[PDB]
Amino acid sequence: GPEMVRGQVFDVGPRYTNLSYIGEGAYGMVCSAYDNVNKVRVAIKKISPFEHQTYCQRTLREIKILLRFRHENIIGINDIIRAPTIEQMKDVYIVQDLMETDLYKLLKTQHLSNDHICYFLYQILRGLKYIHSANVLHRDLKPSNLLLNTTCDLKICDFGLARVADPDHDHTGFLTEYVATRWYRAPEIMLNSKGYTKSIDIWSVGCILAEMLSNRPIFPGKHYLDQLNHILGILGSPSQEDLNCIINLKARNYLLSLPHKNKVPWNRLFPNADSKALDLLDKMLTFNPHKRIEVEQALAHPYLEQYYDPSDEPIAEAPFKFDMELDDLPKEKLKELIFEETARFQPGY
């Protein structure tokens, strides 16, 4: 029999055994396991995306991007399992290195030292520099998508929302709405919902940094439209300069309609925090996408000066172009392309 975990079958045997629940999502489960061939612990991410076109499109991106990345702060695909024939393929199992925990879990039991906070943030942006260098948006950075080891090694995971945006095309109007986990959404996801850029990742990192500072989501929006309130609750009302830059009239007017809100100094929310950390937190959580700090300048910031070394922060040698964005296709065609992507992992080939 294939091992079961909480009544979800995990058809990965006989190579991978002793499964333990580690996490789940809308359309998949993750287990700790033992690689009987390499005599190592692993993590296996069961993905069951074939019923919907969105899940298929995201699954194909997550595999294609992760397969072409190699970076110390980005989880690798060791192995992919699926059925030997497409009709029989109903799930896809993505075997990765087992990390010990994630930031979400770590933050429930630990107040992190300034040194840890600093070093984790350093690693997040080291990764994010590779990701952005490659013309990828991650689009779901949050504590639970950051893995950790007792050595304090960090890895970005869950490229389930990630995507290529070739900088040689204007993606305004073509990007998916409603991306990221709600508390980590940049304001322009709400106001320029198809017109955002990779700066939405730098916003997510601000929220993660805040969360590392206070063990608490800074912007805990109770629902989609409450999220924009919690943001302005701290940042104050946008400047007149910041409103004019919102091209969407519908969204500009809604903001103009809202009551005036005052800025909460970072000092007041993080009274025991490093001032340098609050400075970077300020540049990462800037309302204007265009004035918000970029990944390179973030690393260069004084807070991360013990770790910054552009000689030891790799970038992608072949950044991804429009060709890797041709996924606006029926679920049956995307399943075929997922079959083709995962074939190099099969007895055969």
Ligand X SMILES: Nc1ncnc2c1ncn2[C@@H]1O[C@H](COP(=O)(O)OP(=O)(O)NP(=O)(O)O)[C@@H](O)[C@H]1O
Please identify which residue in 5, 33, 92, 98 interacts with ligand X, judged by CB under 6 A. Answer: 98
Among the residue ranges 34-42, 71-79, 154-162, 242-250, the one whose residues contact Mg ion (CB under 5 A): 154-162
DSSP three-state, residue 60? helix
Q: Check residue 160 for interaction with Mg ion (CB under 5 A).
A: yes
Please identify the residue of the shown chain whose CB is closest to the bound Mg ion: 160
- 176 near 165, Cβ under 8 Å? no
Which of 91, 140, 201, 242 is catalytic? The answer is 140
Of these, 79, 158, 201, 242, which contacts Mg ion (CB under 5 A)? 158
Q: Taking CB under 5 A as the rule, does residue 28 contact Mg ion?
A: no
Q: Which stretch binds Mg ion (CB under 5 A): 39-47, 66-74, 153-161, 191-199?
A: 153-161
Residue 27 assigned to a binding site? yes
**The token pair that represents 291 in the structure block:** 């004035």
**Among the listed residues 102, 211, 242, 313, the single contact to ligand X using CB under 6 A:** 102
CB of 186 to ligand X, least distance (A): 18
DSSP-H helix ranges across 31-74: 53-68
Judged by beta carbon distances under 5 to 8 A according to partner kind, the member of ligand X, Mg ion, none in contact with residue 147 is ligand X
Rounded distance between C-alpha atoms, residue 302 and residue 306, angstroms: 9
Could you tell me which stretch among 77-85, 153-161, 185-193, 270-278 binds ligand X (CB under 6 A)?
153-161
DSSP 327-344: --S-HHHHHHHHHHHTGG
318 is in an annotated binding site: no
Residues in 15-74 at the binding interface with ligand X, rule: CB under 6 A: 22-25, 28, 30, 43, 45
Does 127 sit near Mg ion (CB under 5 A)? no
Continuous segment of H or E residues that includes residue 252 = helix 249-257
Region for 8 from its dihedrals, namely left if φ exceeds 0, alpha if ψ lies in -120 to 50, beta otherwise: beta
Is 202 annotated to bind a ligand? Reply is no
Task: Report yes or no: 28 and 44 within 8 Å, Cβ to Cβ.
Answer: no
Q: Which residues contact 7 (CB under 8 A, 6 or more apart)?
A: none
Cite the beta strand spans of 187-345 per DSSP E: none
Say whether 140 is catalytic: yes
Q: According to the annotation, is 39 in a ligand binding site?
A: no
Residue 13 DSSP SS3: coil
How far apart, in Å, do the first and last CA atoms of the chain sit?
27
Structure tokens at 232: 């302005």
The residue within the footprint of ligand X, chosen from 12, 74, 75, 228 (CB under 6 A), is: 75
Catalytically active residues are 140
| Contact residues for ligand X, defined by CB under 6 A | 22-25, 28, 30, 43, 45, 75, 96-99, 102, 144-145, 147, 157-158, 160
- Binding positions for ATP are 22-30, 45
